[PDB]
């Protein structure tokens, strides 16, 4: 099915007037493959996956030069935004940037992204047409006008529709064993007596990849959201993911309830029932 390449950049000015933190992470789908972290005293773009580590010194020198260029960009951006918003240097502020591309099962371009937040809220985003900007507030209007006058969108489209897709395809071919895998969830149900009057049924999904999954409860084959709880999907630490969903049910009624698991790695959706 689909694949994506994404870069996530975080830039944090510190209380007072010293050096900001800069971190850059790259993903293909839910697999981290590169990092650069000023709080780790990084000097180089560093590999996080076997299939990227096999690239030669040319690749690694090139990625190192470019990540240092991105760092210097965000250094300027922190100063620019203090100016746009009339903020002192005493405060700590955050710039985030995300860009990348999605490809379909045919490995053709579907979508590109290039978007920013400032202090936890949208700042500016490239629209899906890759020609126009959404500016969240009056200050992001300044960036929009500058980027329209400077024709920035046309240079980003060339990368997002061309280079980005071409390198994702190389990564998918080189990493095929890792990136083109699906690990189906290992599923089970638990039962915890809350009182004599209620039980918790907890439906588990473990060691799945990719992260995308749906756990849903039914009662007598009808959708059930009342008295349910569902945790954020979480990383196991070995490149797979976990999730659970739970429902609190009256004593004696356990058999009414079914858990439904959907995941790209399953040949068909699963149905789980509590088995005395």
């Amino acid at each position: 099915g689909s694949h994506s390449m994404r870069y996530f950049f975080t830039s944090v000015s510190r209380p007072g007037r010293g050096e900001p933190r800069f971190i850059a992470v790259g993903y293909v789908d839910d697999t981290q493959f590169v990092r650069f972290d000023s709080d780790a005293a990084s000097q180089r773009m560093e590999p996080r996956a076997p299939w990227i580590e096999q690239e030669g010194p040319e690749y690694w020198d090139g990625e190192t030069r470019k990540v240092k260029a991105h760092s210097q960009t965000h250094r300027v951006d922190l100063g620019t935004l203090r100016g746009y918003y009339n903020q002192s240097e005493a405060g700590s502020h955050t710039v985030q940037r995300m860009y990348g591309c999605d490809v379909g099962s045919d490995w053709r371009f579907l979508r590109g992204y290039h978007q920013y937040a400032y202090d936890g809220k949208d700042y500016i985003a490239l629209k899906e047409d890759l020609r126009s900007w959404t500016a969240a507030d009056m200050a992001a209007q300044t960036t929009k006008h500058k980027w329209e006058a400077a024709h920035v969108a046309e240079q980003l489209r060339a990368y997002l529709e061309g280079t980005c897709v071409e390198w994702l395809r190389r990564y998918l071919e080189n990493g095929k064993e890792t990136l083109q895998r699906t690990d189906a969830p290992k599923t089970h149900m638990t039962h915890h007596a809350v009182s004599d009057h209620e039980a918790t049924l907890r439906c588990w999904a473990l060691s799945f990849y990719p992260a995308e999954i749906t756990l849903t409860w039914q009662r007598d084959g009808e959708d059930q959201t009342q008295d349910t709880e569902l945790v954020e999907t979480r990383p196991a630490g070995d490149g797979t993911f976990q999730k659970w969903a739970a429902v609190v049910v009256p004593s004696g009624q356990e058999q009414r309830y079914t858990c439904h698991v959907q995941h790209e790695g399953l040949p068909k959706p699963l149905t789980l029932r509590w088995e005395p």
Binding site: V76, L156, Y159, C164
Partner: peptide, 9 residues
């Protein structure tokens, strides 16, 4: 593979 160009807010 990172973008080659630099654009400033």
């Amino acid at each position: 593979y990172l973008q080659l160009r630099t654009f400033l807010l």
